Structure 1
Amino acid sequence: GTTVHCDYLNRPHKSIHRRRTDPMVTLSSILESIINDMRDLPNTYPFHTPVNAKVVKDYYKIITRPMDLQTLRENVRKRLYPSREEFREHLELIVKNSATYNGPKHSLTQISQSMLDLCDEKLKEKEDKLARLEKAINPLLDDDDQVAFSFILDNIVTQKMMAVPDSWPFHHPVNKKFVPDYYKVIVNPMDLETIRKNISKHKYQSRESFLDDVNLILANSVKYNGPESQYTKTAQEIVNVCYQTLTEYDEHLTQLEKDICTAKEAA
């Protein structure tokens, strides 16, 4: 057995720094600006900061992934968003949580939606400028091999992994409401939906990076459910089906990995 070698995929290291003219920074500015616009919208103050557990004692027991404009701004400053996609995904979480806790039609949810609508209008307004920044941050976004690679992986997830019997519990993030202590035991949650969203954003340039997330699903199940749990046996099968399929696509994937590596280097 052997694997493809590529030294440019893990470069530069995350030990790199913050330059003002850095593309990632410039983007953080446009995004933070949109945050100021949503915060300025009438009656949005409930979403400006995290829910106060002292006031709403059951909020963090019902909401799996909490989000607010303050936390959103913090993430932007830490340059956690390589593109508008990652940004919008976190933003809509505010709308989703309000729908879950207050109701799909609650006035609060409608208000949170107004922030999301404004965000989209802003994004579509700075369409081109945003496109160039995202491409400058990750040239691979416009690379056909990277796109072909992602497309194949996404099919491994939807065609093979999600097809495993009883696999549903691993299709989406564990819902805290039904498994109250899950996140107190699992500090590195992972699930098939999250992996698909990463694939959509071309996070993986090789099988290895893809498997680092795939493996977490089984590892987490072993940790929370136990080595002999029925849930772990299912997760084991999800991984096994993924591995088996990877060997079947070895020829195509190896070639794509080499091209992506070449494109990664040229970038």
Structure 2
Amino acid sequence: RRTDPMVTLSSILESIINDMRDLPNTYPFHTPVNAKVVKDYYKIITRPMDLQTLRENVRKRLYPSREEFREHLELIVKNSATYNGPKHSLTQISQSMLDLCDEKLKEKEDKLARLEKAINPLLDDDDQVAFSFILDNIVTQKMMAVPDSWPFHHPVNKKFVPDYYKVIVNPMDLETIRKNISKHKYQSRESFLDDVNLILANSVKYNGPESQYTKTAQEIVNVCYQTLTEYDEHLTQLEKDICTAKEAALEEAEL
């Protein structure tokens, strides 16, 4: 049953690296230029690339799609253009590798498009963006409007509260939550609420259960819950559409 789409994609990329390595005359691009032999090379080339580095990157799961892989590959040709010359023999050799890569990626175009959706199912998904937008409005319109909430709007300032980060191991604030929303970190309200509740847990632990600041944090948490309830039906639909889209993508990658 379930194979990880990033493993499947990386294996195709790795196979392409090996086909490029096999090509005649490509050896100077297999490994990084040796600084001790080409003494000025890294003064000219500031983003170096070679087949070994590319393969380590594939291994490290750095590429979620064709596009980021190809970009790095192309840097091998651009760097040769710059260093050896746009029309130099070595530059035509590097281009021979880019050309083989494109041919192999065209060959596997349908499987790759499916792996790529499975790896990043919610890129430009209107349901995720709509869901994020509603959460961001709960934060800015409701949670940040709680009287005296400002000290929870941004991370605690160490300058005025110097033991904070010694006491609190997992700090959280509304600005950090908004940054998470902006990056579409939350797919359902459960993970958003983990962060919102962490704000109150930190204040119960640092300021104490009866502190005025804990009472404020408690009101921020209450308004968050009340507004989510208000919007429950609309949010359930979005959550359903998001969780379903992820699953459908992972299955079409298998099938």
Separation in 2 of the partners of 1:139 and 1:105? 41
Say which is worse superposed, 22-31 or 177-186, in terms of deviation. 22-31
State whether residues 64 and 116 of structure 2, in contact with CA within 8 Å, keep that contact through their aligned partners in structure 1. yes
SS at match of 1:203: coil
Say which is worse superposed, 134-143 or 83-92, in terms of deviation. 83-92
Question: Which protein has the bigger helix share?
Answer: 2
SS at match of 1:114: helix
Equivalent residues in 2 for 1:208-247 (5 A)? 208-247=190-229
SS at match of 1:142: coil
- TM-fit CA distance, 1:102: 41
Separation in 2 of the partners of 1:265 and 1:236? 36
The TM-score normalised by the length of structure 2 is 0.55
Unaligned ranges ≥5, structure 1: 1-18
Equivalence for 2:141:
159
Separation in 2 of the partners of 1:226 and 1:37? 63
- TM-fit CA distance, 1:199: 0.5
State whether residues 218 and 236 of structure 1, in contact with CA within 8 Å, keep that contact through their aligned partners in structure 2. yes
Say which is worse superposed, 120-129 or 77-86, in terms of deviation. 120-129
Q: 1:92 to 1:61 in 2, by over 3 A?
A: same
Separation in 1 of the partners of 2:205 and 2:89? 40
Structure number, greater radius of gyration: 2
Q: 1:248 to 1:183 in 2, by over 3 A?
A: same
State whether residues 144 and 150 of structure 2, in contact with CA within 8 Å, keep that contact through their aligned partners in structure 1. yes
Equivalence for 1:5:
none
Equivalence for 1:254:
236
- TM-fit CA distance, 1:225: 0.2
State whether residues 176 and 183 of structure 1, in contact with CA within 8 Å, keep that contact through their aligned partners in structure 2. yes
Superposed CA RMSD = 10.7
Q: 1:222 to 1:150 in 2, by over 3 A?
A: same
Equivalence for 1:83:
65
The TM-score normalised by the length of structure 1 is 0.52
Q: 1:256 to 1:225 in 2, by over 3 A?
A: same
Say which is worse superposed, 227-236 or 107-116, in terms of deviation. 107-116
Equivalent residues in 2 for 1:104-253 (5 A)? 137-253=119-235
SS at match of 1:29: helix
Say which is worse superposed, 73-82 or 218-227, in terms of deviation. 73-82
State whether residues 118 and 246 of structure 2, in contact with CA within 8 Å, keep that contact through their aligned partners in structure 1. no
State whether residues 153 and 199 of structure 1, in contact with CA within 8 Å, keep that contact through their aligned partners in structure 2. yes
Identity of aligned residues (%): 100
- TM-fit CA distance, 1:197: 0.6
Separation in 1 of the partners of 2:160 and 2:91? 23
State whether residues 136 and 181 of structure 2, in contact with CA within 8 Å, keep that contact through their aligned partners in structure 1. yes
| Number of residue equivalences | 249
- TM-fit CA distance, 1:138: 2.5
State whether residues 141 and 202 of structure 1, in contact with CA within 8 Å, keep that contact through their aligned partners in structure 2. no
State whether residues 5 and 115 of structure 2, in contact with CA within 8 Å, keep that contact through their aligned partners in structure 1. yes
Separation in 1 of the partners of 2:154 and 2:42? 18
Q: 1:97 to 1:32 in 2, by over 3 A?
A: same
- TM-fit CA distance, 1:141: 2.3
Q: 1:219 to 1:142 in 2, by over 3 A?
A: same
- Moved >4 Å (runs of 4+): 19-136
Separation in 1 of the partners of 2:165 and 2:42? 11
